[PDB]
Amino acid sequence: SDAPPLTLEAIKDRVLYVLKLYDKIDPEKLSVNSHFMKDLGLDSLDQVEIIMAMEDEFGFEIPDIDAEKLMCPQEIVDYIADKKDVYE
Amino acid sequence: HGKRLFIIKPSGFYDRRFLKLMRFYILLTGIPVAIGITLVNVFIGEAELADIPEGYVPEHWEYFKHPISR
Amino acid sequence: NVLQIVRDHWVHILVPVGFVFGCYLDRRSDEKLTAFRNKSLLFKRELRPNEEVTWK
Amino acid sequence: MLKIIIPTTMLLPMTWMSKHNMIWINATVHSLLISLISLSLLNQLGENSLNFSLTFFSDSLSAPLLVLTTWLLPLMLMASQSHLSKETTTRKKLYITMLILLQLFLIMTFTATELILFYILFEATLVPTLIIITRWGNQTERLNAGLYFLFYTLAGSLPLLVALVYIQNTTGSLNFLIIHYWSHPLSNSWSNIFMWLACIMAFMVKMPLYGLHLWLPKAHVEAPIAGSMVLAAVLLKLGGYGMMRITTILNPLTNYMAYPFLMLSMWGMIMTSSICLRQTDLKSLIAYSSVSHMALVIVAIMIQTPWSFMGATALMIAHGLTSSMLFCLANTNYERVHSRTMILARGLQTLLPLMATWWLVASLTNLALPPSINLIGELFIITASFSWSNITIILMGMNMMITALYSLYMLITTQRGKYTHHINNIKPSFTRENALMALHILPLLLLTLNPKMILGPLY
Amino acid sequence: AFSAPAAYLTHQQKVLRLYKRALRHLESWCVHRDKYRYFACLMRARFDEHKNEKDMVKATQLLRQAEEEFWYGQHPQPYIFPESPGGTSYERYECYKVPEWCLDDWHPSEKAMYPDYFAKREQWKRLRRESWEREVKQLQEETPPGGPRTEALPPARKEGDLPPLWWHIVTRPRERPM
Amino acid sequence: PPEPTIRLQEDPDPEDENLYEKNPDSHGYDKDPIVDLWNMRVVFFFGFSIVLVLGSTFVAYLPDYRMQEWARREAERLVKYREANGLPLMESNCFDPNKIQLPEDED
């Protein structure tokens, strides 16, 4: 293994990193709690592409039922922290 | 790092106790038996085949080689 | 304490008494099958100077 | 021989005059001492036999069975100590009395110089087993199981008594020694055919034969743990011992006569091993595995060659020990789960690792892994059958494969995987259960060092 | 996996799931990143053409027909994440997942070690005993008559209340206990 | 229907009792700790110590009543003699034909 114990700060940093490299969103307008449907004007297909990027970034894939009802970076971070059993 | 987490596992105390008890009793009887067998083999054992003297009839336990068998 | 543990531990003696009694009964029953003693063709033997029976 | 019988008889007054909380301790200690006493009989000769008296003799076919019968009682007591905890002293004493009487009947059965005495004790063993099954049984079908077990046996054995008295009327003696030295050929006649059938079917039903094996799953599933142990370990071997003893008079009629039985057993081992694959019950699976092994023993006895007899003896001893261990393991699971179904309690290796190790060893020895005596008997019987006919091996091959399958199936369903979430009353295994498994398994791995000690008189 | 399922899947849920499966299988087909990006954008563009279609019968005609095409070219050996239900490490660590109640069976000599852990566990047990008694009444009053219609549980609504049926969700062993 | 819906006056089915709760180190033998421990000790001593060890040693060192070394020595002496005489090892007939009286056929 030799895997560092990733934390909430690292998860959120990597989430926002992936979202800022998403050129459909200008980086200076997004935020932790910024919605996907309304605050950024993104399509549902864009949301599932975001799910693609998250799955390819964290090395695990989210089930479709949970994925299709994830609309904020904050709740995505919370879900992934629950999956990975993150302490702080 | 002081991230030592608690490992939930079933109680191994009873299994270890049973294994220790079984080993203790088995050794308690086997070690004296092994020592006695070694002493008998080194000191007394290994009789060698001979010819029956004329006019002498051997006893029933005198037809065996190992002293413990005799 | 003697005469007290006996009243509770007396039962233990029974199995060994049965064993020795069975050994004695086996010998006694053996005593009744001596009709061919020192008479088998394979083991006709002349008695020792101080021997009466080949086996008991 | 009385040096063994008299202590077994004295076991009864000792049990009934015991203090209310010292019966188990007294019984186990004296049973182990009697077992130690029984060990003297193992030193057999290459000559005729150990003829103690006119009533009892010993043989290297009888000696291993006697030793196993004596050794089984402490294990049965230790297994029964658990579920009889909330029971009155009188009824526990009655249970121990029944076990002691069963041992005494078996001991007198295995020596039995005369065939009518052998039959009397062979059928006397029936009453204590029936009472144990129908009295200290949990389910409501114990009565039907007891009825099946009684009536299959008696329907098989009633012609045997008529055949025996007829044989004594004609020949003039039922003594084993006289019969062996004065054996004469049986002409191929209808009367001789029916005499052969009457002499054979009584021992065939108790093996049991594939056609007549129905009573066994009922009796094994419904009996308590001690009843299952004594049925699987000793009571099934009575038929094999009887066949090996009585077959001498039967020749040369056995060759023609043996075909219906040889075919039934060679197909029934496959049928029962395949039945084991689709079972929802541990006890039924173990019972069907026992049926398969005893069908192989039937084949070995019917072939009637020296290697056949040695393989049959070794397989009988090994199967007795292995099946007793398997039933003990299933009972340990049942006493925690109270369901006695494999698919309910799962992943027990995570919770009970040492008990999982015991399960693995028991399943391996049931699988006939070399150089265990199970495979010694397996291979001797297989070689004898191959010499009998080069086609039998194919069936034997299937049997071996199927056996391994269900064995590991039973190992995988209950020990591997994920533990059922809801069950929470799985307490750590007691010292008593671990000692029971150790005392079951150590004799097998000790005997594999000295196989000749269980290979019978034709060694 | 965490959320309760629905009584059915809508048309948009089906098209999104088909998009997900097709994109994953195309990524499996296109090993290299640039080729995958080009073909994924080509597929996204093709997909968006029928986006404003309003005919329901036509909508049914779309995607289902695509599903047959997806089944024909579904890359019989797709890429699966190691911990996914088809991955090579799907249930590697299920053998290390020991239940919590097993700690109730430890010998006192074992409980002598780790005393603070067992004190906190006792506090947890007290909290569970009180909270379950509250939760039984809360779920009894909040459940619709005739039995629940969807297997979703309501949250806690009072101050000292806890989520109903929480003990076995909070007390999961771990993802990687050892 | 004024029936009590109870077929008979019955005791409730008791729950299983744990030997570990009221007594750690319970050995699964008895609810009384002293009888428990002594039963464990006697079972272990009379099974593993006495029977499995002393009995195995006794069986291992049993005298040759099967006569295996006797048979080996007999065969050794017999072959030593036969090779020297020029006799052809073991004979085909188990019994000497001169002392067997066949029945004459005259067919």
Ligand SMILES: CCCCCCCCCCCCCCCCC[C@@H](O)O[C@H](CO[C@H](O)CCCCCCCCCCCCCCC)COP(=O)(O)OCC[N+](C)(C)C
């Ligand atoms: C149900 C689960 C299994 C139960 C146990 C089954 C095993 C018992 C079955 C008995 C095996 C066969 C019995 C008799 C075999 C004799 C050999 C015979 O089959 O071959 C021919 C015999 O021909 C015919 O078979 C004649 C008999 C026909 C009548 C028998 C009924 C056939 C089917 C009945 C089966 C039912 C069995 C169960 C009853 C409850 C040979 O012709 P032949 O040279 O002239 O007779 C030689 C014998 N001699 C020398 C004594 C004269």
Ligand SMILES: CCCCCCCCCCCCCCCCC[C@@H](O)O[C@H](CO[C@H](O)CCCCCCCCCCCCCCC)COP(=O)(O)OCC[N+](C)(C)C
């Ligand atoms: C826990 C991890 C391991 C720790 C321990 C490490 C040490 C391992 C050693 C243990 C086994 C390894 C193999 C070593 C074998 C050496 C001993 C062996 O040679 O002795 C055997 C002896 O063993 C016995 O023969 C077999 C044991 C007897 C079995 C009887 C069962 C005990 C009674 C209990 C009740 C019975 C229940 C079942 C009813 C049938 C064979 O002896 P044999 O080659 O011949 O001749 C001996 C010498 N003579 C010629 C003078 C006679």
Ligand SMILES: CCCCCCCC/C=C/CCCCCCCC(=O)OC[C@H](COP(=O)(O)OCCN)OC(=O)CCCCCCC/C=C/CCCCCCCC
């Ligand atoms: C399933 C078991 C196999 C059953 C196979 C056949 C079943 C059909 C038979 C039903 C019962 C038939 C009863 C009458 C049979 C008559 C046989 C007979 O009398 O032979 C006796 C014969 C010779 O008679 P004698 O007149 O004295 O000789 C002088 C001239 N030579 O002497 C004997 O051998 C006596 C032995 C008793 C024969 C046994 C009769 C019962 C049938 C045999 C047992 C087979 C059934 C076993 C039931 C299995 C249930 C587990």
Ligand SMILES: CCCCCCCCCCCC(=O)SCCNC(=O)CCNC(=O)[C@H](O)C(C)(C)COP(=O)(O)O
């Ligand atoms: C490599 C394997 C090959 C696989 C083959 C795959 C075949 C692909 C071609 C399928 C053609 C189609 O588009 S299938 C035609 C299905 N019908 C419709 O799309 C009508 C309305 N569309 C929706 O409702 C969607 O949800 C949408 C508006 C897009 C987003 O919704 P959001 O706003 O809620 O995110």
